[PDB]
Amino acid sequence: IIGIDLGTTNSCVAIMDGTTPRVLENAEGDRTTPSIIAYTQDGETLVGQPAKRQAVTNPQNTLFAIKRLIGRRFQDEEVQRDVSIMPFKIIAADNGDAWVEVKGQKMAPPQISAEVLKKMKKTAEDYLGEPVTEAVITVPAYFNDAQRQATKDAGRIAGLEVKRIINEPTAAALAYGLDKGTGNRTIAVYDLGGGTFDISIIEIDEVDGEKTFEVLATNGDTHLGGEDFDSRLINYLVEEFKKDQGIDLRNDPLAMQRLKEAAEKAKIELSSAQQTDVNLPYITADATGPKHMNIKVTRAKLESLVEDLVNRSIEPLKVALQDAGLSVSDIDDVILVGGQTRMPMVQKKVAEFFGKEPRKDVNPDEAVAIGAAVQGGVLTGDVKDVLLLDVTPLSLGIETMGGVMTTLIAKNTTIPTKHSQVFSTAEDNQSAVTIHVLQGERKRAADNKSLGQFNLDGINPAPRGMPQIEVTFDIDADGILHVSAKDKNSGKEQKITIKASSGLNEDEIQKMVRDAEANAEADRKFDELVQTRNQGDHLLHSTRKQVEEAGDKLPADDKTAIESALTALETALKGEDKAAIEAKMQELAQVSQKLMEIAQ
């Protein structure tokens, strides 16, 4: 299992290297890869940086920000706004889904988002060397089943089985190590990403027995930070250039795009230094030749352009508390996600509000992928839960007198499940039993798979039929099989624990179905002998004592005749012959008319 972080703007993939988190890097040498897919006009399907690097050249067939659309329907508040702003041809699907039209062909966005996952899968495979067939994947907290399944569908289309699908706040909490080692923590997750903002206030409780990861309150914004802020700076840089160099840029789409990317980088520096220089060679050209742009910007000029939108990240931070009914002191940890959370101004303004400095002790364009890795790796490794009734192949049971499998857990029942049956000793003055744990579907125990065996010794000198030996089969929720046997007279228990990976594999399971379905006639022909052998054993044993109870009440001829037939039954019961046993039981029973009158 690999940990994929599927973002809005940017994608990152990770694994657990033993116990240690490892964050991987693409063939181009990038870690956090852009979640951009572009169908080049002459047919090439590009992903990532080579999808951004041509994005000006073929925008109508450039797909970005698909997490907004992934599993929403044509009439929705996001899709209706996306259709108003997004350059690529969004359409209504034939089911009313929000779909894309590219180069004239209609496609379902799990198919599109798969090209991120196929690149991430390749990126992961390229480090490991072995083919990967499994994933864990991220989502926001406020996504419904259709949006959660759409991401799992995107996984399946990539040949990645989605072995869990986890939330971005859970991933954030896991990433900074909040799996264990407190009784309770109340966390604030501040996600100020590439092109979205989320606040999720979440509770991690261990006091219900080391299990709850719950979302208490979430809020967020659609067009926050960034676009209305960087626009104050873009416009200053335009008006400074218009002033200094006597030419406009709002007319130039390329200069706007380059000014956007350049100034957005500069803004991120100026919250971490006093100054940086907005240098742009060959920005625009006119009758006086080219214009080279070099504008000096400071935090001080910046701070006086940008009085607004960080506060718009402290405003929903109020509702997320007001709806929950908690105070800033009740929160243990304020934890950061998203690449804008390297800008001092948000780190400062979050600290100022919460009072305790936010944690960024794991890199916040990777952490949310480490949150996938730490679940995917050692955890979903193995571990956890759910409930009962039916599914879910082969039967589990034990060997009983006859050499027959007696079934405790039936074929096609789910986990966890607890069932039991009461057994006994087979001989008089028998002080112990073997418990042989069978997996299979055949009658004859020697034809089923021996999972294990154990003993229960120390049964008191009782007569047979009487010692109440309970055998209990318990299958836990990790699939681990626990078999327990107990004497109810003394209370002396013995156990065995058998792994979910013990016993028969898929092909052995298929054989067993073919084996048990084909040999049904042969197995019944045995089961119908086991029944007769056991009836004969009861009669042989009881009629021996019905003589010993009778004594001098029983005449010599009867004693002579009955004891003769008792011997012969004890010979026939060393045969595999049913008919001889049924006959010798009759040859015996016929002569026990007077014996039964005495035993009566």
Side-chain angles (χ1 to χ4, degrees):
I1 314 178
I2 62 170
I4 295 177
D5 185 18
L6 179 60
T8 304
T9 317
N10 266 301
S11 299
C12 191
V13 57
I15 58 174
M16 288 179 87
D17 191 340
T19 187
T20 62
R22 183 180 295 294
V23 182
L24 303 179
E25 46 199 284
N26 74 15
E28 307 88 314
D30 329 299
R31 289 171 181 299
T32 296
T33 293
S35 308
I36 304 179
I37 299 154
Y39 282 66
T40 302
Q41 72 299 325
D42 295 285
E44 306 183 333
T45 315
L46 300 179
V47 185
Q49 193 70 253
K52 190 176 78 96
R53 277 179 177 160
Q54 72 176 29
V56 179
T57 67
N58 184 19
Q60 293 188 20
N61 305 281
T62 298
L63 306 172
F64 65 97
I66 303 299
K67 180 177 265 179
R68 286 175 176 257
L69 294 171
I70 187 55
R72 278 178 180 253
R73 292 179 78 204
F74 194 64
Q75 180 56 266
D76 158 287
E77 84 310 327
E78 190 67 358
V79 180
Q80 78 184 244
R81 61 198 167 222
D82 284 17
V83 164
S84 77
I85 60 170
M86 300 299 173
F88 53 91
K89 180 54 178 163
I90 297 167
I91 49 168
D94 312 56
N95 213 292
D97 258 9
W99 275 19
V100 296
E101 202 188 284
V102 186
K103 271 177 73 80
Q105 47 171 348
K106 298 201 285 176
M107 284 179 287
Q111 299 176 287
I112 300 307
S113 285
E115 298 298 356
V116 164
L117 274 65
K118 290 147 73 75
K119 185 177 166 78
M120 292 304 101
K121 185 179 202 291
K122 179 64 169 74
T123 286
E125 284 166 351
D126 282 345
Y127 179 72
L128 288 169
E130 74 188 278
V132 168
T133 34
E134 305 185 311
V136 165
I137 315 171
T138 52
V139 282
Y142 64 89
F143 270 24
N144 69 29
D145 299 274
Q147 298 195 53
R148 281 174 71 91
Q149 183 57 46
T151 303
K152 288 164 63 207
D153 278 23
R156 185 68 192 189
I157 291 162
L160 287 162
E161 300 209 324
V162 185
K163 300 301 198 184
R164 212 164 279 173
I165 186 176
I166 66 166
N167 321 339
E168 288 151 18
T170 310
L174 289 164
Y176 296 101
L178 285 58
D179 277 84
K180 57 179 171 66
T182 336
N184 180 339
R185 290 196 203 197
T186 304
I187 307 171
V189 188
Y190 183 94
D191 192 335
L192 183 62
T196 30
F197 172 69
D198 270 289
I199 166 62
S200 287
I201 299 190
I202 67 179
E203 291 276 33
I204 312 306
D205 182 4
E206 314 297 1
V207 185
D208 72 341
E210 315 279 289
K211 179 246 130 269
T212 242
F213 283 77
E214 183 174 289
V215 177
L216 186 64
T218 284
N219 198 269
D221 182 358
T222 310
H223 289 271
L224 189 144
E227 69 205 65
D228 308 317
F229 236 18
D230 304 336
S231 284
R232 300 283 181 159
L233 181 59
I234 303 325
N235 274 284
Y236 172 73
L237 287 162
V238 171
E239 295 298 304
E240 197 91 291
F241 183 97
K242 194 186 87 194
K243 175 203 305 174
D244 275 321
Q245 287 157 280
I247 289 292
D248 175 28
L249 262 63
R250 292 183 180 98
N251 191 40
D252 184 299
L254 177 140
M256 277 287 108
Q257 209 69 236
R258 285 172 69 200
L259 193 53
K260 185 178 177 181
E261 268 185 306
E264 284 177 355
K265 178 177 184 285
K267 190 182 98 295
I268 288 170
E269 288 168 10
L270 292 169
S271 296
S272 75
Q274 296 291 324
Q275 60 166 98
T276 197
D277 277 2
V278 175
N279 191 338
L280 271 167
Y282 289 94
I283 195 54
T284 48
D286 68 80
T288 59
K291 296 292 174 297
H292 295 182
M293 175 175 198
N294 189 13
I295 308 294
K296 180 164 64 178
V297 191
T298 59
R299 190 182 285 166
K301 282 283 177 289
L302 181 69
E303 273 165 338
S304 193
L305 289 164
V306 303
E307 180 70 309
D308 183 359
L309 300 173
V310 165
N311 300 286
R312 237 178 79 206
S313 83
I314 308 302
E315 295 312 321
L317 203 53
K318 299 176 196 297
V319 309
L321 286 169
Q322 287 160 331
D323 287 356
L326 295 181
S327 192
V328 293
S329 191
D330 306 335
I331 309 306
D332 306 93
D333 266 314
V334 49
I335 62 173
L336 302 179
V337 182
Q340 207 81 211
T341 67
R342 296 184 186 97
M343 188 174 68
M345 189 164 42
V346 288
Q347 286 156 103
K348 181 173 77 175
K349 291 269 295 205
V350 172
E352 281 179 358
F353 190 62
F354 279 106
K356 306 191 291 281
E357 295 291 344
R359 201 172 172 222
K360 200 183 71 180
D361 187 33
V362 183
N363 179 38
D365 39 30
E366 300 169 28
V368 49
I370 288 166
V374 75
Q375 184 73 204
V378 174
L379 207 163
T380 321
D382 195 285
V383 271
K384 258 168 162 274
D385 269 303
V386 296
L387 229 70
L388 53 64
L389 170 119
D390 296 297
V391 138
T392 264
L394 306 177
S395 316
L396 296 161
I398 68 168
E399 185 172 310
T400 52
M401 180 177 85
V404 74
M405 180 185 193
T406 305
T407 301
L408 270 286
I409 313 292
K411 182 159 61 283
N412 302 144
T413 297
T414 60
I415 54 170
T417 181
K418 178 173 172 174
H419 290 114
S420 291
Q421 200 167 107
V422 180
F423 293 101
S424 165
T425 45
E427 275 75 17
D428 279 341
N429 205 38
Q430 178 177 357
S431 50
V433 291
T434 324
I435 305 294
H436 186 216
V437 183
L438 294 172
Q439 184 188 14
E441 300 282 308
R442 310 297 264 69
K443 290 287 161 287
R444 188 188 289 266
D447 301 0
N448 289 299
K449 188 83 154 209
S450 191
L451 294 187
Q453 57 177 355
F454 71 100
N455 290 120
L456 173 61
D457 72 312
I459 303 170
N460 291 112
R464 78 172 193 156
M466 305 300 296
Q468 288 169 40
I469 310 304
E470 198 166 71
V471 176
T472 286
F473 271 55
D474 165 41
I475 319 182
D476 76 33
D478 290 305
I480 305 173
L481 170 62
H482 308 276
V483 179
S484 40
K486 171 164 282 147
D487 159 41
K488 297 201 185 194
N489 145 98
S490 63
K492 189 165 163 294
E493 188 160 290
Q494 283 300 287
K495 282 185 59 168
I496 197 170
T497 285
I498 291 163
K499 298 185 292 187
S501 51
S502 300
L504 298 182
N505 86 58
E506 285 261 63
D507 219 55
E508 292 171 286
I509 286 170
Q510 279 200 29
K511 183 182 188 285
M512 180 52 56
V513 169
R514 302 162 202 158
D515 219 271
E517 198 165 12
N519 286 274
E521 291 182 347
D523 259 44
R524 195 225 70 245
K525 264 191 175 184
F526 175 66
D527 197 25
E528 79 156 284
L529 169 66
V530 165
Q531 175 56 225
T532 302
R533 272 183 169 180
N534 283 5
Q535 287 168 9
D537 179 83
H538 184 257
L539 189 64
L540 172 69
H541 178 236
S542 292
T543 301
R544 266 174 165 151
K545 284 185 175 172
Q546 286 165 320
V547 169
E548 288 181 331
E549 290 167 69
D552 321 60
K553 301 160 206 154
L554 190 68
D557 313 69
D558 288 87
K559 186 175 166 64
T560 301
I562 290 164
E563 288 175 8
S564 295
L566 275 169
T567 304
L569 181 57
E570 220 225 75
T571 304
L573 283 163
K574 320 197 199 319
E576 296 278 282
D577 189 301
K578 174 169 176 153
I581 296 163
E582 288 190 90
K584 288 306 183 185
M585 281 171 66
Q586 199 192 249
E587 193 177 300
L588 178 58
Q590 277 163 313
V591 297
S592 288
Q593 200 174 130
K594 181 58 186 180
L595 213 201
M596 285 284 159
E597 196 198 59
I598 296 161
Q600 202 285 124

